[PDB]
RNA sequence: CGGUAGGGGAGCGUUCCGUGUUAGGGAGAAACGCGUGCGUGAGCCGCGUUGGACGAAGCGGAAGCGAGAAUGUCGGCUUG
RNA sequence: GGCCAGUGAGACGAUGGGGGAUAAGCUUCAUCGUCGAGAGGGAAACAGCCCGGAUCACCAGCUAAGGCCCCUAAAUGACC
RNA sequence: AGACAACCUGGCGAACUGAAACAUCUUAGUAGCCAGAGGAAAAGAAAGCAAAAGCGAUUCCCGUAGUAGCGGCGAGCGAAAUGGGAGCAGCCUAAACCGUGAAAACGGGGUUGUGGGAGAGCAAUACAAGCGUCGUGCUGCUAGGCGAAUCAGUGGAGUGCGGAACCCUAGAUGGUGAAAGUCCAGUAGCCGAAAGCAUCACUAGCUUAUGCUCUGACCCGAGUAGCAUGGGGCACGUGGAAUCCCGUGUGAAUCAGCAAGGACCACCUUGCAAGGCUAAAUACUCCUGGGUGACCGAUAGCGAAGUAGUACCGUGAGGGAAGGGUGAAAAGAACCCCCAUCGGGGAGUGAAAUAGAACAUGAAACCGUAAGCUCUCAAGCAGUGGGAGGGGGACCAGACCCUGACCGCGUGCCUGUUGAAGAAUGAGCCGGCGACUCAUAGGCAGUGGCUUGGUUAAGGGAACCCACCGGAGCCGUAGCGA
């Protein structure tokens, strides 16, 4: 019948890492980079966990990716 | 067991709660949806992932890198098999190890790609019992384990790429010792 | 485990023919065979039921009277479901579902039903039939001599389905013949009295071993 | 799979039979039979707690009116002064009952409260 | 051990189905009306100079499953 | 943490203030009490004030707030 | 020619909607309109997929897969290849060449792809298969035929109950005063067609036809492909934009070639466009013939159980109802009285006449009549607690039921608010109809089945369900990085 469709606008932003947790790329990097600090530009260059609110929001908005909790 | 005396265990089948059948039932009246709003009205309601007019969670985050470029994603090109899959197996001292051996034994069950990704033997775990492996290429540590066990190790060349005769000529010119 | 006598047209106690099946564990049995039964007679069902919703009836798709200036409700259809002239809400669509039950749970349901069938003197046992002139009198006479009433709803099944017992057995209501081609659970869990043959007790031990 | 029923009429006929002697459309008319069942039962609640309270009040004023027949200024409070000093544990205002069912015996009660 | 919005646990009832061509039933079933009975209650059980052929319980399942509201709606009958 | 809801209109009273005219049962905040979601008693009646937190029964007793001439239960109580 | 419910093809072709606005997009090439046509239609026999390994026309199902992608990279849209099944079937034509005719045609030849065909020469004969008015053949259908086995007692009637017997190749069903294996029609089984239709098997007969060597010359579908533009559609919204088809304009090569393999070039691989035709699997019901139903039972089920698309409304397009059940058998009331009828009472039929034609059970609102208690100095959401007086049957006679002198207390119910007796909303009343439901997926919880990891989908099956196959796929086994 009707399969659920994977939301592509968040599948390109979120990712599972083996143990089963959503990670994400930090924002504020491809715009006005001289104005910032190198401390900021490698603070905003790493991928981190998403917090539990929007870890449980998009877990049902992106169904086919095997995330526990 | 007769047709009479059969009955399910408790907890196996709960009753589906019916809504709007009385306030003593639990979800009477507004059927458990408060008073008003989009959560009480009938229809599709709210898109999941929508922040109420705020720019959402997914739009404020930049796209993942190769998925931003549209580059083809990282994809497994072999079957990763450790030596822990080989010791716990019932392979005895005289036994061949190949694709159909690991399929027919009960270690790998490959279905989606029987055609593309052959095999690879990795390093974690030991292998005390010697064998005769004719499978695809190895890691350096797994070559150290299998050559440390004194077993017959054989790499298998899978496919031959098509090299153009001027590229094969330019590469055959490079044989200058 | 427990033996059982092999009867005939005479009725001696020759042979053993042990019935060793794959039983369900205790406290877990009646939920398993209840589950296989309830999907047997749930899967036996069919759609066969229909009703016309608001979008199908030949009632009006018009506004019968305007929105205001009339002391009467806002009724915008004559085939509205609030009005008993047609149109229903949430009635039965003709649904042809698929309730799948596991194989080795259903085989264990059959093995638990036949496993609980024997032991409480509900199984006597035959081995052969040779019925020239099939006429249902030696059938009900052998049925009487084996200790089975024709009205007490017995059931029994035979290998290879010889035609002269299908011909002499299909008229009495209380029993119907089966075969390993057509061995169900609901027809065999009537469980009043039920017999086997040697090809069915050794086919039945051949399949549901240990 | 039509499901026309009769259970609203037994559900409703029981409440119909409870609402007898309600003087008019409170005893005949269903959409008021319900709320008279309801209001009759809460009337039974508050009039039960206040029948405990109300009979307490009635026995207080009844034994007060019994004690005040002496003429000399002996109130109801002084009857409890010398009803608990002379150790009589909890006659429970049923001396307001034998104060009229046995007036010589309540005269023996009070005339032994004096001594 | 008060309780609105709300959450969880446990149950009653209805029509159909398996047992079921069930027990029972023109020696009166269902209905309709009745109770000095029993339950926390949804309800059960019992009685009927009414009615005239169906249909329990138990163990289970499935719902067009439960009414006092929608200027609801369809019939009947009031008020003035 | 997992699953899964509502709520996001508050109101008055005391204190701390701003707006006002130190006017509003006015408006906005900060801590608290009640109502909301709280029955009963006192307040004549009367959401927010005081006592007080209702599982149920009793034709039981003792009390808090508050009262003891009559309506309406208890002192036409005592002494300044 | 006209008609045809739905499916199918071709053309015109939206908009409300979703994006929380909206224009790109979606809804959607859906609805609608027109045309055509058959029981199926379309497509269909590689100028094809694929990737150095291979498959062999088209269609449909499971799967890959909600993957690769596409997209104000928003809302959303979403393949294909590998794999597993259902069903299988391939054939005619143009050109080069000979012959007749001023061409245009005609008759032979040839229609193929790790290339053929034409031209020249050598051999060689019959195996197999295709098509088919025609009539003998077969089964099936459109009429039907034979077809087993019991009485008696019971309150109207027996099929139910109790007592005595039997059939079964028949105990499916419908009816018969009442429920049936033995009462009837039937059924199981055995039979049966003058005539027509259909199913495959004969037949006078037409046909398909063969192998080798040389020969790059001659041919292999031209205003066509390609290109510059304007686009459409392939999941792909002009993007690197390929494949496919069109509008204007330019405009090739024949096999030593041309096209495709996701701009394009080189090599290789694959195929041979610019010519047509084909059954099957496949989708649906205005229907037809069988079998079913945890489908309905007169507010339901078709709108329609009678005049049903009827009465009625509208100029018209069109909208659109409602009304079932006396009995088993009318046995439907002879006759007498009231009397102009309608109706009523006797009598008669019936088991029932309180089953009388408004006729089956008949509830509530509503209207009444009779019996018990009680109201005309009385303020009240009509109650409730206490209960004066009175009445009724009674047996655990103290109990139970009905009435209510008087006192205390008590601001209808829902909605929905900070707050509703509210003079905020709603309902004249009574009875019915009337609302978190269904399909498919993700996630979690609870109960199971296996852990020699688990489980099948499509599909096959004694008509369906089903035993048993069917390991395709899916999930967990390895992660990190773009």
Swiss-Prot record, chain A:
Location within or outside the cell: Plastid, Chloroplast
Top-level taxon of origin: Eukaryota
Family of this protein: Belongs to the bacterial ribosomal protein bL35 family.
Role summary: Component of the chloroplast ribosome (chloro-ribosome), a dedicated translation machinery responsible for the synthesis of chloroplast genome-encoded proteins, including proteins of the transcription and translation machinery and components of the photosynthetic apparatus.
SUBUNIT field: Component of the chloroplast large ribosomal subunit (LSU). Mature 70S chloroplast ribosomes of higher plants consist of a small (30S) and a large (50S) subunit. The 30S small subunit contains 1 molecule of ribosomal RNA (16S rRNA) and 24 different proteins. The 50S large subunit contains 3 rRNA molecules (23S, 5S and 4.5S rRNA) and 33 different proteins.
Identification of the protein by name: Large ribosomal subunit protein bL35c
Species whose genome carries this gene: Spinacia oleracea
Organism ancestry: Eukaryota, Viridiplantae, Streptophyta, Embryophyta, Tracheophyta
Full-sequence range covered: 89 to 157 of 159
From Swiss-Prot, chain B:
Biased composition annotated in UniProt, kind: Gly residues: 23-35
GO BP, sorted A to Z: translation
Localization, UniProt: Plastid, Chloroplast
Keyword Transit peptide belongs to the record: yes
Biased composition (Basic residues): 12-22
Positions in coiled-coil regions: none
GO molecular function annotations of the record: mRNA binding; structural constituent of ribosome
Keywords attached to this entry: Chloroplast, Plastid, Ribonucleoprotein, Ribosomal protein, Transit peptide
Principal subcellular localization: plastid
Family: Belongs to the universal ribosomal protein uL15 family.
Physiological role: Component of the chloroplast ribosome (chloro-ribosome), a dedicated translation machinery responsible for the synthesis of chloroplast genome-encoded proteins, including proteins of the transcription and translation machinery and components of the photosynthetic apparatus.
Protein's name according to its UniProt entry: Large ribosomal subunit protein uL15c
Span covered, complete protein: 80 to 256 of 271
UniProtKB/Swiss-Prot annotation, chain C:
Tissue specificity of this protein: Highly expressed in cotyledon and weakly in roots.
GO molecular function: rRNA binding; structural constituent of ribosome
GO biological process: DNA-templated transcription termination; translation
Highest taxon, organism lineage: Eukaryota
GO cellular component terms, semicolon-separated: chloroplast; ribonucleoprotein complex; ribosome
Keywords, sorted A to Z: Chloroplast, Plastid, Ribonucleoprotein, Ribosomal protein, RNA-binding, rRNA-binding, Transcription, Transcription regulation, Transcription termination, Transit peptide
Listed Basic residues bias regions: 65-75
Residue ranges, annotated region (Disordered): 56-87
Subunit structure, as described in the record: Component of the chloroplast large ribosomal subunit (LSU). Mature 70S chloroplast ribosomes of higher plants consist of a small (30S) and a large (50S) subunit. The 30S small subunit contains 1 molecule of ribosomal RNA (16S rRNA) and 24 different proteins. The 50S large subunit contains 3 rRNA molecules (23S, 5S and 4.5S rRNA) and 33 different proteins.
Function: Component of the chloroplast ribosome (chloro-ribosome), a dedicated translation machinery responsible for the synthesis of chloroplast genome-encoded proteins, including proteins of the transcription and translation machinery and components of the photosynthetic apparatus.
Family that this chain belongs to: Belongs to the universal ribosomal protein uL4 family.
Name of this protein: Large ribosomal subunit protein uL4c
Organism: Spinacia oleracea
Shown segment, full-protein numbering: 52 to 261 of 293
From Swiss-Prot, chain D:
Protein's UniProt keywords contain Transmembrane: no
Biological process terms in GO annotation: ribosomal large subunit assembly; translation
One Pfam family named in its UniProt record: Ribosomal_L20
Family annotation (InterPro entries): Ribosomal_bL20, RIBOSOMAL_L20_CS, Ribosomal_protein_bL20_C
SS bonds (residue pairs): none
Main location group: plastid
GO molecular function: rRNA binding; structural constituent of ribosome
Gene3D superfamilies from the UniProt entry: 6.10.160.10, Ribosomal protein L20
Keywords linked to the UniProt accession: Chloroplast, Plastid, Ribonucleoprotein, Ribosomal protein, RNA-binding, rRNA-binding
Tagged with keyword Metal-binding: no
Protein family per UniProt: Belongs to the bacterial ribosomal protein bL20 family.
Function: Component of the chloroplast ribosome (chloro-ribosome), a dedicated translation machinery responsible for the synthesis of chloroplast genome-encoded proteins, including proteins of the transcription and translation machinery and components of the photosynthetic apparatus.
Record note on quaternary structure: Component of the chloroplast large ribosomal subunit (LSU). Mature 70S chloroplast ribosomes of higher plants consist of a small (30S) and a large (50S) subunit. The 30S small subunit contains 1 molecule of ribosomal RNA (16S rRNA) and 24 different proteins. The 50S large subunit contains 3 rRNA molecules (23S, 5S and 4.5S rRNA) and 33 different proteins.
NCBIfam families membership: rplT_bact
Protein name as catalogued: Large ribosomal subunit protein bL20c
Gene designation per UniProt: rpl20
